Amino acid sequence: STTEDEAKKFLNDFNSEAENLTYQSSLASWDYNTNISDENVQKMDEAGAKWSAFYEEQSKIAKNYPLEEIQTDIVKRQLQILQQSGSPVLSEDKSKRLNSILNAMSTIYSTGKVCKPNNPQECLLLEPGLDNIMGTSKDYHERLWAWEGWRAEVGKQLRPLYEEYVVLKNEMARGYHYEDYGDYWRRDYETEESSGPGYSRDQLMKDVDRIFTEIKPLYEHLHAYVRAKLMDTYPLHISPTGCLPAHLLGDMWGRFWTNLYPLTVPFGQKPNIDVTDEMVKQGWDANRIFKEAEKFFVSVGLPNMTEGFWNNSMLTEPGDGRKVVCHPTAWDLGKGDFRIKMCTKVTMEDFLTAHHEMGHIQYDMAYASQPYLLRNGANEGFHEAVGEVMSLSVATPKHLKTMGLLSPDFREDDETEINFLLKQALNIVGTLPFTYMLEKWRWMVFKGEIPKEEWMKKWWEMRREIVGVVEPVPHDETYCDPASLFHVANDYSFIRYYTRTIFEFQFHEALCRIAQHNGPLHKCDISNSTDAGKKLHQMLSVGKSQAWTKTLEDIVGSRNMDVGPLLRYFEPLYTWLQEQNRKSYVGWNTDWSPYSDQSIKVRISLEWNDNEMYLFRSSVAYAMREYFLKTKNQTILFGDENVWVSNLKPRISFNFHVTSPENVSDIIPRSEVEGAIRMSRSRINDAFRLDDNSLEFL
Amino acid sequence: STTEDEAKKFLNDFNSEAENLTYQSSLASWDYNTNISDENVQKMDEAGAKWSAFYEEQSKIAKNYPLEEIQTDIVKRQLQILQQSGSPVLSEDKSKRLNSILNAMSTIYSTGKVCKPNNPQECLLLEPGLDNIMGTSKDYHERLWAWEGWRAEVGKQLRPLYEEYVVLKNEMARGYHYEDYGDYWRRDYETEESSGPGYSRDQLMKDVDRIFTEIKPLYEHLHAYVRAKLMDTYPLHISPTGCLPAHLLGDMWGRFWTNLYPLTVPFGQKPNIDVTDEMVKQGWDANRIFKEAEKFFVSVGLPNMTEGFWNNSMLTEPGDGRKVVCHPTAWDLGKGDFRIKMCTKVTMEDFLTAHHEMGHIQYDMAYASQPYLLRNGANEGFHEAVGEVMSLSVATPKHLKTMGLLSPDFREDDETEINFLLKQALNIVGTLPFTYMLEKWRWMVFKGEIPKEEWMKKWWEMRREIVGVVEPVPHDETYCDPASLFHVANDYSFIRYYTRTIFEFQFHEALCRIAQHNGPLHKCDISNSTDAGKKLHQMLSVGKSQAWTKTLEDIVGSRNMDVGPLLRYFEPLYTWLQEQNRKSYVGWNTDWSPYSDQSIKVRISLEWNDNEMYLFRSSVAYAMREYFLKTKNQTILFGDENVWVSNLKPRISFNFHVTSPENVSDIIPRSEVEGAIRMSRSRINDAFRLDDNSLEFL
Amino acid sequence: PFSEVFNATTFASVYAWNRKRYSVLYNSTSFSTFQCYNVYADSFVVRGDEVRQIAPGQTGVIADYNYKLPDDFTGCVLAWNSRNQDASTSGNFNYYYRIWRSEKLRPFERDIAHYDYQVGTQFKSSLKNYGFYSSAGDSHQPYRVVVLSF
Amino acid sequence: PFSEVFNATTFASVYAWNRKRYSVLYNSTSFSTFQCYVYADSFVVRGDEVRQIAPGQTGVIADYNYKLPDDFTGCVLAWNSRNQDASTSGNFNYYYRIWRSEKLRPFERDIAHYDYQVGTQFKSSLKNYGFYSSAGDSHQPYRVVVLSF
Numbered sequence A, B: 001s002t003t004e005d006e007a008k009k010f011l012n013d014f015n016s017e018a019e020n021l022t023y024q025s026s027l028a029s030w031d032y033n034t035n036i037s038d039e040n041v042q043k044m045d046e047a048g049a050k051w052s053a054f055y056e057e058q059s060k061i062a063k064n065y066p067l068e069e070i071q072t073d074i075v076k077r078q079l080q081i082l083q084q085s086g087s088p089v090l091s092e093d094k095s096k097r098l099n100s101i102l103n104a105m106s107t108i109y110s111t112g113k114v115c116k117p118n119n120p121q122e123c124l125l126l127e128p129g130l131d132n133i134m135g136t137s138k139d140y141h142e143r144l145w146a147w148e149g150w151r152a153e154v155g156k157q158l159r160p161l162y163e164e165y166v167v168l169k170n171e172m173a174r175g176y177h178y179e180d181y182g183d184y185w186r187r188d189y190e191t192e193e194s195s196g197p198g199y200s201r202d203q204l205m206k207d208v209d210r211i212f213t214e215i216k217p218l219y220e221h222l223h224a225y226v227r228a229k230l231m232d233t234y235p236l237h238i239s240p241t242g243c244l245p246a247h248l249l250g251d252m253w254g255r256f257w258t259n260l261y262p263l264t265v266p267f268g269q270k271p272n273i274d275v276t277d278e279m280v281k282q283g284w285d286a287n288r289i290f291k292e293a294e295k296f297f298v299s300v301g302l303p304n305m306t307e308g309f310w311n312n313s314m315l316t317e318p319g320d321g322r323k324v325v326c327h328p329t330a331w332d333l334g335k336g337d338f339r340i341k342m343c344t345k346v347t348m349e350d351f352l353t354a355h356h357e358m359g360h361i362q363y364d365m366a367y368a369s370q371p372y373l374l375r376n377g378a379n380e381g382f383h384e385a386v387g388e389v390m391s392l393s394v395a396t397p398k399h400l401k402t403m404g405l406l407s408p409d410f411r412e413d414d415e416t417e418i419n420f421l422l423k424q425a426l427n428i429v430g431t432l433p434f435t436y437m438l439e440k441w442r443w444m445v446f447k448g449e450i451p452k453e454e455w456m457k458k459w460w461e462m463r464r465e466i467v468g469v470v471e472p473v474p475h476d477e478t479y480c481d482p483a484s485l486f487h488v489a490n491d492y493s494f495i496r497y498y499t500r501t502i503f504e505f506q507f508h509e510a511l512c513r514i515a516q517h518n519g520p521l522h523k524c525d526i527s528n529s530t531d532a533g534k535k536l537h538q539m540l541s542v543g544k545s546q547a548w549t550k551t552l553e554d555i556v557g558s559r560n561m562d563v564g565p566l567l568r569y570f571e572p573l574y575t576w577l578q579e580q581n582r583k584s585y586v587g588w589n590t591d592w593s594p595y596s597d598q599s600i601k602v603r604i605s606l607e608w609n610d611n612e613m614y615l616f617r618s619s620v621a622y623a624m625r626e627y628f629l630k631t632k633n634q635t636i637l638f639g640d641e642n643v644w645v646s647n648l649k650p651r652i653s654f655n656f657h658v659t660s661p662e663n664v665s666d667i668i669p670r671s672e673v674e675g676a677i678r679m680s681r682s683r684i685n686d687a688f689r690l691d692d693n694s695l696e697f698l
Numbered sequence C: 001p002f003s004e005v006f007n008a009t010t011f012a013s014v015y016a017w018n019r020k021r022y023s024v025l026y027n028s029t030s031f032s033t034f035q036c037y038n039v040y041a042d043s044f045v046v047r048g049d050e051v052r053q054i055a056p057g058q059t060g061v062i063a064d065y066n067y068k069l070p071d072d073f074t075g076c077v078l079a080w081n082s083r084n085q086d087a088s089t090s091g092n093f094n095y096y097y098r099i100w101r102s103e104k105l106r107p108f109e110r111d112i113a114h115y116d117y118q119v120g121t122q123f124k125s126s127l128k129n130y131g132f133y134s135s136a137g138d139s140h141q142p143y144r145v146v147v148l149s150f
Numbered sequence D: 001p002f003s004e005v006f007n008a009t010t011f012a013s014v015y016a017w018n019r020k021r022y023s024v025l026y027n028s029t030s031f032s033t034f035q036c037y038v039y040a041d042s043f044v045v046r047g048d049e050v051r052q053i054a055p056g057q058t059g060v061i062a063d064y065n066y067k068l069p070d071d072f073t074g075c076v077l078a079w080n081s082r083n084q085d086a087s088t089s090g091n092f093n094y095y096y097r098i099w100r101s102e103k104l105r106p107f108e109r110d111i112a113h114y115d116y117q118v119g120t121q122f123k124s125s126l127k128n129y130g131f132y133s134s135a136g137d138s139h140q141p142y143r144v145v146v147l148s149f
């Protein structure tokens, strides 16, 4: 008869088979993750292959049902989810090439190594070796070596793979009736809500631009304060007016400024909150931590953890010979099975992480009543926003004093609040321009606004003008610096981290308003409050059955993403930062570089292609060799790779500077290079058939 | 009173206090080797440090006693051994620098890695990775990559360390009243025998030169046959007249030609002798193998293995969780304790190795009656010569037929004898010019005949003219190709392998003459021969109590090293090789190279130092880039490292050739490079301020 | 009523329920649902979520395709969990439910037929097994349900 | 002759003997050396110098330690004792004299712990036997009983 009845029958059959296949795949994945060995990986492989084949077959079946006839919103949403992703239109060779490219990028990222200049047998991987250097070291040159070895021994490998990956993904997304792969990623946050204003995919770009323009002053003041603070530890490397070098930000990409906290802590004599000693006392174990988290979630009115949760979950590291992955994850296995897999140590970080994963589990149990396609967060940021807002409400000193974990003799002054707010801002506010800029760069790359010959130029342009971060070494088009991040090389969307913070602080302000909190927003606890828990459960129960705008308007009263709660959270810190940035300069200019003062401008006066660039770099290296031999009696083997070209106009002019071999931090002074050019001017001028008037060498 | 009595008292005290702590160091080393742990390392290090301190202190005491006033031969030999080695005269900083240099060279050799051109994450160590390629691969380009990656990523690291090591060792040996470190190494084979003709240190050099000139024709015919057989595999890569490329010789350094046997085997349809199936049948184990070896050694009249030998020695890999080093070694622990440590498998190689190590043990129990200083072989080659001659006598097909491991239906024709003799010659005759040339190079480097600026030039010159082996890639003074060998980087003498081969077949011919063998020398078995065993025990009983020349004259009837028995061993193979090499060319010329045909001679007519060489290589690379861009429409990033300079006269002339980036085997044809020079001639002649007449570019 | 009905080792499915021709029931305390709405006893091994489907005046897959309760009161509804008998680690797919009918049933109509119904462009079986895993939630664990009538 | 002499738990060193003022000996077959040429002397000399007990040779034990006259009227007994006088880590409770200023006459003893001069430094004239269980027959402890009539 009518096609919506056929769609209902097809959806019922698909749910009946999918709730079984995905449960079996989840059981196999859990068996592998809690017990790492062979004959366990291939079980996941066959379960996932069966689930993927079934999913693409049912998507091809669901493409038959039209959407414009169907008026019921639930079946329309399920059919939209089914039809949006299915079998790609790519050919078998194109699909195989795309899979090979993705696997190659993942393998290069995971197994790439950087070797020290001296001792070539000491090569460090990313995760145990280079991450420790970028997180802990306060040496400019070691950090520069770790930062420049990455993106050159790894990113240069990823540049052609990413160049082919962009084309293949753009073709695949164009086969899904989208403009590009960025639009396909922005197919989330897309609603067909009633009354007319549905959320479009370009509305997300407009909204994130507006949110960034609203958060620019607070980030500018935080940037100025951080610059003034680490001008003390790097005295002759930081410009008081310019941007910050990219390798002095606490990690290799500058994603989080959390590791900069010991460098930039105000009132260092005040101890931070750490109840780890009070939990190695009083006999706190993993079960005590998770029972305290369950008590906190009971206090707001959310249901208890299931009896199967306490049995089947891996709440601690197994003592027997069963290797596991030590990453905290909340598992929605299906058919009412909710488990948490984490190696809980007795630490405050694991306490907050347990609360975060219990928030994930509570979201899963809340939307478990929905049909299978709608059993997810409202968008990709909502789940982590809920986890982070429960972790935010738990970590207050009032909550720890109420639990008896913190001693009641502790006194919360204004100095400790500023320290807590600054430690929050280095992780929350410092990550927002980086996330926004990276997603903007990827969107313009997929759209085609950035040509393939301008990738690194555009990337290090918006890094200066948006993040206020300058590269320490010039990078031409042989580099791929975005691909040095995990989410770019492993094909992951990044805007969910941007929207997570906005939704998290919106939820925090709403729930603190409901729970009758009267003080500052950062000292708010929603414990033993049934109204806040009731409205939170109302938000969490509707998984994907309605638009995320409608759910957001239900919980916070606004249909749009608002960063006003985020600025109200950091308002005392904003006032203190404005007070501290009085003798300093707020803002940055995009002209200064670490290599900018020692660079020599070369003006081309007359076919100067890349081979002529190579010949020029070789002639400059020869001139440096001759100058250091005939002046300082030193034998230094300068190469063409030690001459760095920046600000390259295609045929007009460029700038060059020379670094020492085996020390990319050791930039040769401009007077030395000028004397080298003056001494060996004849060979350099003759090798290009021109006089000293053509090549100015200012 | 007389200094003889005080010397006797001092020697008695020294041996009484040396046997103790020598047994303790041996026991600690055995406990580490049979049970590898970090706890067992410390006891070894403590015992070794105590023994070393005691030894150097007693050597300082022994320097007081003069050798000119003692007439007893045994006391004189013990005092000379004590006084020759002791505390070095090097300063504390110099000794520390030498120890650090030796440790650095060992660490670079053991931990050096070579990465493939594609996939930079795939890097191979020498022992499991590169050795397999050099021993098994029949690909020219993969072998060239493995051979060129070694000595470039490892040997170039070892070049300055070896340069300092030579100076430090020369100073240390000059402090021991020797001319150089080569003379200090040649302090072995030095006798003070009666009647006047004592063996001197220069006599060893004269004798090894004479022995090499005597073995030159057989090695020339073997080289011609191997070249003719490796002209079938590797076509258009081997000159029928010139030398052999260094990377096609069965291993990395061309030390042994054993792995070339499948390519050079005559009569490939005839199966080789292998009784491994007959020992996995009949229930043969490690104990059966060692009991058979003990029966063989008893059959000639040598004593039984001791009860402690069966009780304490590790004759098989331990079943329990004890890590061991799987290297066959015979241990003389001291105080009558003789053990063999090896992971015996049921293979013919382990059978011959068991006989070899039991020959070592029989030598140890034979000289165990001597005082502690004289409990060694007569020289450094005698021990391995005895082990290898027992292995020679036990490997005959007649012995295996008598034992029952070989079926009586097997028939020994002339074809199988030729196969056995060729397989012997690839390990015995093929290693002699390499060993002789390497020791000659090290002796001339230590003496100072080869200056530091001519190390690689001289090394490849005597490789071409002595071994008949040409390098596939030119190597300047930045390389250290000898240091890529284990014995050079780990400070080990190499002439003992040369003298072992001579003494081996001298002993074999003597013992086969005594045992009344009438057939060919390679089919001789000394089993059931009490006279041969009696004379062998007479030779082995005197450890170092007399001169090695006297012991050699006692066993073989000649006072000098003679290679005539070695040539008599290989006489049927020599006749067959002369019959095979009629249509081939016997000998080599030292002018042909793999890169010689495609090299362009450049004549300098007029300050052309290394910087001008770098500028020339860069200009040539730019010309190649321009030619491949403007002619074949290909973008190939030629660098200065892709231009190889050979036959470099210091300011007169040189030859150059271009290889492709990322394929050192891909040499650009000479016509293409000539067209590249002709197209971009203006920049090339302009970069050095000259015309095209001075640089001929023939 | 009798011990043989309640303690049956093999128990029939939802669609093909077999009928047979009190202080222990009150004081057993293992019955999760105790709402009383010849002695005939019916056989249901429905899911825990679908226990509320055995009640008058409602809709659902069991309520409109499987066994149906009329709009008057006749007997008693009993239900208890059975995760130990008919639930396994690898799953217990031995119970079936009817996913679709051409028309809604009469208040006590029953059919054990095995016909294929139309979904999309293919014919698929109208009888789908139950996924009864032991490590599952309370809404998906097997619930042993017996209704009675006189 | 008596079982207490042969089965004594502790035998003293070679330099310090313990004298005391036959079908079992013939048929025991545990004695490695049973050569004859009531005072019973006891030593724990090593295996290779069991032959040093016999009269008419030189060495270390022959002169500086226990010394046998040219004419003898007694028996010499010796047996391997690795199970009692040898240990895994070494048993250094037995000592031997290494040097005397003058050669010994037959049958005298000294207990003096004097030092003596070798090289440039002074050291004790008593050196302890290194008796290990994992040693050869020549380097194994041998309990020696010599009768004199």
Ligand SMILES: *[C@@H]1O[C@H](CO)[C@@H](O[C@@H]2O[C@H](CO)[C@@H](O[C@@H]3O[C@H](CO)[C@@H](O)[C@H](O[C@H]4O[C@H](CO)[C@@H](O)[C@H](O)[C@@H]4O[C@H]4O[C@H](CO)[C@@H](O)[C@H](O)[C@@H]4O)[C@@H]3O)[C@H](O)[C@H]2NC(C)=O)[C@H](O)[C@H]1NC(C)=O
Residues within 6 Å of the ligand: B016, B017, B020, B021, D092, D113, D124, D126, D127, D128, D129, D130
């Ligand atoms: C083989 O190497 C091992 C390594 O362990 C050596 O074994 C150690 O040997 C020493 C030998 O001195 C031994 O020390 C003896 O231990 C006992 C106490 O622990 C005592 O029996 C004895 O004390 C004597 O020496 C002291 C130092 O001289 C004197 O002060 C003291 O009076 C004792 O009497 C002797 O010395 C005086 C000197 O005035 C003299 O008048 C006496 O007559 C008498 O001679 C020692 O200290 C260790 O115990 C041994 N270690 C173990 C673990 O057993 C072994 O000696 C080495 N063998 C050789 C040949 O070098």
Ligand SMILES: *[C@@H]1O[C@H](CO)[C@@H](O[C@@H]2O[C@H](CO)[C@@H](O[C@@H]3O[C@H](CO[C@H]4O[C@H](CO)[C@@H](O)[C@H](O)[C@@H]4O)[C@@H](O)[C@H](O[C@H]4O[C@H](CO)[C@@H](O)[C@H](O)[C@@H]4O)[C@@H]3O)[C@H](O)[C@H]2NC(C)=O)[C@H](O)[C@H]1NC(C)=O
Residues within 6 Å of the ligand: A016, A017, A020, A021, A024, C093, C114, C125, C128, C129, C130, C131
């Ligand atoms: C979740 O996903 C898994 C995937 O592994 C499914 O596992 C399946 O389990 C079912 C149930 O065990 C298996 O289905 C089989 O189908 C047949 C049904 O009857 C057919 O034949 C009759 C004719 O008599 C027709 O009328 C009817 O229409 C059907 O065509 C039977 O062959 C099977 O029953 C027999 O199973 C075995 C095999 O002989 C016997 O031991 C039994 O006694 C019994 O007689 C059976 O029901 C199916 O094969 C399994 N697949 C796999 C890949 O293992 C889960 O069921 C699934 N769950 C859901 C809810 O979808």
Ligand SMILES: *[C@@H]1O[C@H](CO)[C@@H](O[C@@H]2O[C@H](CO)[C@@H](O)[C@H](O)[C@H]2NC(C)=O)[C@H](O)[C@H]1NC(C)=O
Residues within 6 Å of the ligand: A035, A037, A038, A039, A040
């Ligand atoms: C952890 O993994 C191992 C190996 O993957 C499991 O061993 C298997 O156990 C099953 C149990 O049914 C056996 O059928 C297999 O034969 C076993 N495989 C092997 C290779 O021995 C082990 O059981 C797992 N441990 C846990 C606690 O689940």
Ligand SMILES: *[C@@H]1O[C@H](CO)[C@@H](O[C@@H]2O[C@H](CO)[C@@H](O)[C@H](O)[C@H]2NC(C)=O)[C@H](O)[C@H]1NC(C)=O
Residues within 6 Å of the ligand: A299, A401, A402, A527, A528
């Ligand atoms: C507010 O919630 C908290 C837990 O977050 C409760 O705090 C403690 O509860 C125990 C158990 O009843 C009491 O014995 C303690 O005195 C409480 N500590 C406090 C209030 O600091 C608390 O009970 C909740 N509030 C109310 C009013 O019940």
Ligand SMILES: *[C@@H]1O[C@H](CO)[C@@H](O[C@@H]2O[C@H](CO)[C@@H](O)[C@H](O)[C@H]2NC(C)=O)[C@H](O)[C@H]1NC(C)=O
Residues within 6 Å of the ligand: A141, A142, A663, A665, A666, A667
């Ligand atoms: C590499 O070069 C840097 C920069 O020249 C060296 O680091 C220090 O640089 C400062 C000036 O910035 C000098 O005052 C110091 O003398 C330099 N050395 C040290 C040890 O602090 C650096 O040493 C060079 N070498 C390496 C291996 O990094």
Ligand SMILES: *[C@@H]1O[C@H](CO)[C@@H](O[C@@H]2O[C@H](CO)[C@@H](O)[C@H](O)[C@H]2NC(C)=O)[C@H](O)[C@H]1NC(C)=O
Residues within 6 Å of the ligand: B035, B037, B039, B040
């Ligand atoms: C192998 O080595 C280990 C570690 O060195 C030995 O373990 C030691 O055994 C001794 C026996 O006396 C103990 O005193 C130590 O405490 C042990 N050390 C440790 C760290 O466990 C082990 O016995 C060795 N095995 C054999 C067979 O010799």
Ligand SMILES: *[C@@H]1O[C@H](CO)[C@@H](O[C@@H]2O[C@H](CO)[C@@H](O)[C@H](O)[C@H]2NC(C)=O)[C@H](O)[C@H]1NC(C)=O
Residues within 6 Å of the ligand: B299, B402, B403, B527, B528
């Ligand atoms: C020569 O040595 C061989 C072993 O290498 C002896 O061969 C066997 O020895 C056993 C033991 O005497 C005899 O029973 C067998 O008959 C021998 N085998 C063969 C095939 O002859 C051989 O006996 C030795 N020769 C002499 C004379 O003793």
Ligand SMILES: *[C@@H]1O[C@H](CO)[C@@H](O[C@@H]2O[C@H](CO)[C@@H](O)[C@H](O)[C@H]2NC(C)=O)[C@H](O)[C@H]1NC(C)=O
Residues within 6 Å of the ligand: B141, B142, B663, B665, B666, B667
């Ligand atoms: C590297 O270069 C060599 C030499 O050009 C290539 O090996 C073969 O060379 C022969 C001539 O010697 C040609 O006929 C073949 O076409 C070449 N290729 C193959 C696959 O046999 C070699 O392929 C080049 N590349 C690599 C990765 O080694």
Ligand SMILES: *[C@@H]1O[C@H](CO)[C@@H](O)[C@H](O)[C@H]1NC(C)=O
Residues within 6 Å of the ligand: A298, A303, A304
């Ligand atoms: C949660 O658990 C507590 C403690 O077991 C219990 O008293 C309480 O009733 C439970 N809450 C719910 C809603 O079941």
Ligand SMILES: *[C@@H]1O[C@H](CO)[C@@H](O)[C@H](O)[C@H]1NC(C)=O
Residues within 6 Å of the ligand: A307, A308, A311
């Ligand atoms: C949890 O484990 C306990 C103890 O083994 C058991 O009694 C209980 O039934 C289990 N619950 C499950 C598996 O749901």
Ligand SMILES: *[C@@H]1O[C@H](CO)[C@@H](O)[C@H](O)[C@H]1NC(C)=O
Residues within 6 Å of the ligand: B298, B303, B304
């Ligand atoms: C060697 O040992 C064997 C086996 O125990 C024995 O028969 C033979 O007599 C011994 N030979 C000697 C010379 O001790």
Ligand SMILES: *[C@@H]1O[C@H](CO)[C@@H](O)[C@H](O)[C@H]1NC(C)=O
Residues within 6 Å of the ligand: B307, B308, B311, D133
């Ligand atoms: C030889 O080994 C046996 C068996 O372990 C042992 O009883 C005996 O004491 C050992 N004999 C020696 C070490 O002389």
